[PDB]
Copies of this chain bind each other. A is one copy, B any other.
């Protein structure tokens, strides 16, 4: 059999086929040597034996508030943040490596941004089993697997107090870089840009952008409804939007991310950010009476890109992490480091971010309780209630726990089933192999994975070997940290993808991170002091309860 099917090469070593049946591991710069890159160098050895486990660090970071407050007020905050940023980031290859067509480095893979990249090469097509060498010749029925371990029975709230405001931000935010192409197939994205470029607000292509712009004062087109500002209709902004046949254009809003009409939650943020852009335009014009529409537009976009990163690191991730350490967004922390300011979305990162357990059984707005059939394509909810009302509602309703299993509402369970099926098409390597790729020891049994016995026994019977457990199912079934939203894998595997994506942005480079880039001191401060509360309230008639945490 093909030797690489055994994943012989350890610690990021590269398996290459030589001759008709041999293989070799390129252990270059892995910190190890030997046939499979297992013989540790002196510093490699010290580092791995002195490194406390993920569980222990997580414990340190969620205990001793008093000590953390003291630390957050010192330069240590800067030391630890830079540490998190660099260590977390070094786990992501930059420039990118493989894609769905090349399980090896190639010029096509480096230049062709229509491909998602991947961290581990696919499971070779000629391996004994679908997962490589372990498990059964046939994987568990995707739908049965989902109905048995992911379907929600009783709604489980997130112990960390995460609300729907956070849940919709996450969806809205990620859909600017997760845009799998239906015509091209799995492993392909339309989200060229591969990151926080705000394409979900300005469009992922120029012509779409243009149809969305006013071309006056650098602003975005809009319409007034009830004396409030909302994205324009597809009639004033002839842009492709995905709405069910039978809905008139005069009821379809145009936003840049064609799929946003599918949820009031998504169109809410589309509205909020649109209002913020035009607001920033007004501020720039006061400072620069000589500027034209283009410069105003471009500069506001850079500012909004900055605000988003600021808000994602300091509030979004802060809420997710649960850390007592006050995370900080400051590009300077990396100026003395070796870091590439480029980013490429990975298919694994896409899989990992399918956080459907967050959605509730129904959507409570005031005393009214809306069902999925009343929420999904409602093109009038947003305008009926307005921004303040929905923000207050979503900020008050608790979202579901992500990890732990059995927590995805039946209405959207089909999404999980399809993620599992796509994983097999993409031939994603086993969960334990990804565990290793991110610094963890593989699980030695299902009972070790879940913190229990019943599910474990049933998973063991279906998969046959813990080494056959798949990527996505692994993330969602792994036991959660104490009172956390998900397990360690989600953190240890997602932190690297996230942070590299936030800081590996051109505006974070020494060349771009200057006040001139944002129109001056005033534009720069909008980025440096951006807040979820200001994003909403500086754009609404009244200020509601706004937060990523339930009250």
Q: Which residues of A line the B interface, CB within 8 A?
A: 14, 16-20, 24, 26, 28-29, 93-95, 97, 101-102, 104-112, 192-193, 197-198, 206, 287-291, 294-295, 298-299, 301-302, 305, 336-342, 506, 509-512, 514-517, 519-520
The reply to whether B20 and A289 contact each other, CB–CB distance below 8 Å, is yes
The reply to whether B511 and A102 contact each other, CB–CB distance below 8 Å, is no
The reply to whether B511 and A97 contact each other, CB–CB distance below 8 Å, is yes
The reply to whether A14 and B97 contact each other, CB–CB distance below 8 Å, is no
The reply to whether B520 and A95 contact each other, CB–CB distance below 8 Å, is no
The reply to whether B291 and A106 contact each other, CB–CB distance below 8 Å, is no
The reply to whether A14 and B516 contact each other, CB–CB distance below 8 Å, is yes
Known A-B contacts: A28-B515, A106-B299. Give 11 more (CB < 8 A). A14-B516, A16-B516, A16-B520, A29-B510, A94-B509, A94-B511, A101-B294, A102-B294, A104-B516, A105-B511, A112-B206
Instruction: Report the separation of the CA atoms of residues A506 and B95 in the bound assembly, to the nearest whole angstrom.
Output: 6
Residue of B with least CB distance to A287 = B18
Which residues of chain B are within 8 angstroms of A512 by Cβ–Cβ distance? Answer: 95, 105
The reply to whether B514 and A29 contact each other, CB–CB distance below 8 Å, is yes
The reply to whether A17 and B290 contact each other, CB–CB distance below 8 Å, is yes
> Could you tell me the distance in whole angstroms from the C-beta of A496 to the nearest C-beta in chain B?
15
Q: Are A18 and B294 CB-contacts (below 8 A) given A26-B515, A28-B515, A341-B340?
A: no
The reply to whether B298 and A102 contact each other, CB–CB distance below 8 Å, is yes
The reply to whether A26 and B516 contact each other, CB–CB distance below 8 Å, is yes
A107 interface neighbour in B29, B301, B338, Cβ under 8 Å: B301
> Could you tell me the distance in whole angstroms from the C-beta of A213 to the nearest C-beta in chain B?
12
Instruction: Report the separation of the CA atoms of residues A338 and B336 in the bound assembly, to the nearest whole angstrom.
Output: 8
The reply to whether B298 and A93 contact each other, CB–CB distance below 8 Å, is no
Residue of B with least CB distance to A101 = B294
The reply to whether A106 and B341 contact each other, CB–CB distance below 8 Å, is no
The reply to whether A298 and B108 contact each other, CB–CB distance below 8 Å, is yes
A520 interface neighbour in B24, B112, B305, B511, Cβ under 8 Å: B24
Instruction: Report the separation of the CA atoms of residues A18 and B284 in the bound assembly, to the nearest whole angstrom.
Output: 10
Which residues of chain B are within 8 angstroms of A95 by Cβ–Cβ distance? Answer: 341, 506, 509, 511-512
Which residues of chain B are within 8 angstroms of A198 by Cβ–Cβ distance? Answer: 107
The reply to whether A105 and B302 contact each other, CB–CB distance below 8 Å, is yes
Instruction: Report the separation of the CA atoms of residues A108 and B291 in the bound assembly, to the nearest whole angstrom.
Output: 17
Would you list 10 pairs from A and B whose C-beta atoms are within 8 A, ordered by A residue? A18-B287, A18-B288, A26-B515, A28-B514, A28-B515, A95-B511, A105-B516, A105-B517, A106-B301, A107-B197
Instruction: Report the separation of the CA atoms of residues A339 and B339 in the bound assembly, to the nearest whole angstrom.
Output: 8
> Could you tell me the distance in whole angstroms from the C-beta of A546 to the nearest C-beta in chain B?
27
Instruction: Report the separation of the CA atoms of residues A109 and B338 in the bound assembly, to the nearest whole angstrom.
Output: 24
Which residues of chain B are within 8 angstroms of A104 by Cβ–Cβ distance? Answer: 295, 298-299, 516-517
The reply to whether B17 and A291 contact each other, CB–CB distance below 8 Å, is yes
Residue of B with least CB distance to A342 = B342
Which residues of chain B are within 8 angstroms of A107 by Cβ–Cβ distance? Answer: 197-198, 298, 301-302, 305
Q: When A and B form their complex, which 6 residue pairs have the shortest distance between CB atoms, in order from nearest?
A: A26-B516, A106-B298, A14-B516, A95-B506, A28-B514, A105-B517
Which residues of chain B are within 8 angstroms of A516 by Cβ–Cβ distance? Answer: 14, 16, 26, 28, 104-105
Which residues of chain B are within 8 angstroms of A14 by Cβ–Cβ distance? Answer: 514, 516
Instruction: Report the separation of the CA atoms of residues A17 and B289 in the bound assembly, to the nearest whole angstrom.
Output: 9
> Could you tell me the distance in whole angstroms from the C-beta of A207 to the nearest C-beta in chain B?
13
Instruction: Report the separation of the CA atoms of residues A336 and B29 in the bound assembly, to the nearest whole angstrom.
Output: 13
Instruction: Report the separation of the CA atoms of residues A237 and B510 in the bound assembly, to the nearest whole angstrom.
Output: 46
> Could you tell me the distance in whole angstroms from the C-beta of A273 to the nearest C-beta in chain B?
15
Instruction: Report the separation of the CA atoms of residues A18 and B301 in the bound assembly, to the nearest whole angstrom.
Output: 19
> Could you tell me the distance in whole angstroms from the C-beta of A444 to the nearest C-beta in chain B?
30
Instruction: Report the separation of the CA atoms of residues A94 and B94 in the bound assembly, to the nearest whole angstrom.
Output: 15
Residue of B with least CB distance to A519 = B16
Instruction: Report the separation of the CA atoms of residues A108 and B204 in the bound assembly, to the nearest whole angstrom.
Output: 11
Q: Are A102 and B289 CB-contacts (below 8 A) given A514-B14, A514-B28, A516-B16?
A: no
Which residues of chain B are within 8 angstroms of A97 by Cβ–Cβ distance? Answer: 511
Instruction: Report the separation of the CA atoms of residues A107 and B203 in the bound assembly, to the nearest whole angstrom.
Output: 12
